Design a binder for this molecule. Structure first.
Ligand SMILES: [Zn+2]
Ligand SMILES: [Zn+2]
Lengths: 261, 67, 49, 148, 115
């Protein structure tokens, strides 16, 4: 009649991805955790652009969208910054946004590659991932001799539910029950399917025997970060975000019970 | 037109991989070895780099509107 | 149900047999059985039907 | 105390006409105390059954050891003494047909009761003297337990 | 032309009760929790955590429509219990799960970073 006692075991941790295993937890909890990893982890992404000059072959909406998809370092600042909607300021301020600026002109005869390295931010903590000192710089647009591109962007705090640019993951490999013991899938020819990397079976075997008393446990994860948040910070922010969502829901629930009590 | 920034499917950054991919092709790499060297394991990201047509380089051959 | 059946089947399936006391006893209750066997008006009505 | 049948059914065959489904198998069984053929559909995935096994089948109208009708509702928070605890496999179905060898004049000596456990069908055929409590449109249970 | 703003999925439009409790009259000790601006992320966990409660006879959730951003959770408990109390304990238990999982994840991260 109470909660379970989940455990965790990290099998790999790098700057790009984190591979871990959660045990003694429900499939609903593990799936919600994955959904938070994908849609409800706030990060900093350009969400406001003012094109002061754009003579390139790509129209303004194209440049805006392309800047929006550029990931920005959001490791420790995203927890400090608030949502522009909740901020009580005027258009912007350092508490709710990060100013960026771009001013490039192709004076030489060679094509000028406007890259993420040209995005100058007012805050040194929020910079393009390629700009954090390997990987090359993201390409915003190529310019021809005589063309110019000058704009002024502002980054905001958001999560995946608002737009995919605020999704900090580049893939969340969620898996459970590598050996089909629970038979949640039914392979018509189990011998034709390959073995999961987390599978523990001899090559002569195809799938584990059926377990009537089995329940989904030991969920395997591989959270590849896009660069904005460290792979482990994505998980911590996801757990904290889901706990905050449940806490606010509990507040509204209690306010509704006492409404009738 | 220009190489996208994220992979449409997963979201992996690919915008910074186009130039490296071309440099590898000129470096006598196969498209598969190049996509592996760039760290593109999912076939969705491999689709992004392998099916791209860089038209921007041809749009830059036309004189601009302003000099 | 009274188009294809042959004359024999038609009669065996549709003519109410009110002379088989055993069958009447099984299908109908004692009061109905006795009434059907004794009363002749009911039998005549069944035949007319 | 509501029990409408109780007899052992040595399993004589499983899926004689061939395996039609995967998580279900048809068992053709015969008893020894009453000589009653039985065609049953069970969930061999969770309750496997092998050729030659021997089980006790107890078709009852209620699970409560004391005579008391059931409400047909799923209430797992009921701690009263139920006869299901003493068995392994328990089903819940309804009688949807009772055939027999009755003629226009002679009564039925041999009967064949059909029951449907949410699709899993059973045909219990034998002597009518032992299948008098079986009536159509009556919710019944199975209470099948494998013994050695 | 008719595309709803993306923030409509999570942001309440205005004067919108985040959660509404409606007593179900079909059966006793049952209620419907209509939560606005939520989805399967919370509906699934709350359903599962209520199913884990032995005093909960029925626990289910649904999204009436994908375009709408509302969710309905039906909860039926034993007469000695209450659906509101069940929903409160389920949320408290989910919160404890996330707190404990977060703590153990911090510990694992530290142990892995050191060695
Ligand atoms: Zn502000
Ligand atoms: Zn991809």
């Amino acid at each position: 009649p109470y909660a379970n006692q989940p455990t965790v075991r990290i099998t790999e941790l790098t700057d790009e991805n984190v591979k871990f295993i959660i045990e003694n937890t429900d499939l609903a909890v593990a799936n919600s955790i994955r959904r938070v990893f994908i849609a409800e982890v706030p990060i900093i992404a350009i969400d406001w652009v003012q094109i002061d000059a754009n003579s390139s072959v790509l129209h303004d909406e194209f440049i805006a969208h392309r800047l929006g998809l550029i990931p920005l370092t959001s490791d420790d600042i995203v927890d400090k910054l608030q949502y522009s909607r909740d901020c009580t300021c005027e258009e912007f301020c350092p508490e709710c946004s990060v100013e960026f600026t771009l001013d490039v002109r192709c004076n030489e005869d060679q094509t000028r590659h406007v890259t993420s390295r040209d995005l100058i931010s007012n805050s040194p903590r929020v910079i393009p991932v390629t700009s954090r000192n390997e990987q090359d710089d993201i390409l915003i647009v190529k310019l021809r001799k005589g063309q110019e591109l000058r704009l002024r962007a502002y980054a905001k705090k958001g999560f995946g539910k608002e737009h995919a640019k605020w999704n900090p993951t580049a893939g969340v490999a969620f898996e459970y029950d590598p050996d089909n013991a629970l038979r949640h899938t039914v392979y018509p020819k189990p011998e034709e399917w390959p073995k999961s990397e987390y599978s523990e079976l001899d090559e002569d075997e195809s799938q584990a025997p059926y377990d009537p008393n089995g329940k989904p446990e030991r969920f395997y994860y591989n959270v590849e970060s896009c660069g904005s948040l460290r792979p482990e910070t994505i998980v911590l922010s996801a757990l904290s975000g889901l706990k905050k969502k449940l806490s606010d829901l509990q507040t509204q629930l209690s306010h509704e019970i006492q409404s009738d009590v | 037109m220009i190489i996208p920034v994220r992979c449409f499917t997963c979201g992996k950054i690919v915008g910074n991989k186009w130039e490296a991919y071309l440099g590898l092709l000129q470096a006598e790499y196969t498209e598969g070895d190049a996509l592996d060297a760039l760290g593109l394991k999912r076939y969705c990201c491999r689709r992004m780099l392998l099916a791209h047509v860089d038209l921007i380089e041809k749009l830059l051959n036309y004189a601009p509107l302003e000099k | 149900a009274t188009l294809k059946p042959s004359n024999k089947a038609f009669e065996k399936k549709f003519r109410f047999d009110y002379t088989n006391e055993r069958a009447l006893r099984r299908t109908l209750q004692e009061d109905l059985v006795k009434d059907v066997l004794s009363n002749a008006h009911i039998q005549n009505e069944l035949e007319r039907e | 105390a509501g029990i409408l049948f109780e007899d052992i059914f040595d399993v004589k065959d499983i899926d004689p006409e061939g395996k039609k489904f995967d998580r279900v198998s048809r068992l053709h069984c015969e008893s020894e105390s009453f000589k009653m053929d039985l065609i049953l559909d069970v969930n061999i995935q969770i309750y496997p059954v092998d050729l030659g096994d021997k089980f006790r089948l107890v078709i009852a109208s209620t699970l409560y050891e004391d005579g008391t009708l059931d409400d047909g509702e799923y209430n797992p928070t009921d701690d009263r003494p139920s006869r299901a605890d003493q068995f392994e496999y328990v089903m819940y179905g309804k009688v949807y047909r009772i055939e027999g060898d009755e003629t226009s004049t002679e009564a039925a000596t041999r009967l064949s009761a059909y029951v449907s456990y949410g699709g899993l069908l059973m045909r219990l055929q034998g002597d009518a003297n032992n299948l008098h409590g079986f009536e159509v449109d009556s919710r019944v249970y199975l209470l099948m337990k494998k013994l050695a | 032309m008719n595309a709803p703003p993306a923030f409509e999925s999570f942001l309440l439009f205005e004067g919108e009760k985040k959660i509404t409790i409606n007593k179900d009259t079909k059966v006793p000790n049952a209620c419907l929790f209509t939560i606005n601006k939520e989805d399967h992320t919370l509906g699934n966990i709350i359903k599962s955590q209520l199913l884990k409660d032995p005093q909960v006879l029925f626990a289910g959730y649904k999204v009436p429509h994908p375009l709408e951003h509302k969710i309905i959770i039906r909860v039926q408990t034993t007469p000695d219990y209450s659906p509101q109390e069940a929903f409160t304990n389920a949320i408290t238990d989910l919160i404890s799960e996330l707190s404990l999982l977060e703590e153990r994840f911090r510990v694992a991260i530290k142990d892995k970073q050191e060695g």
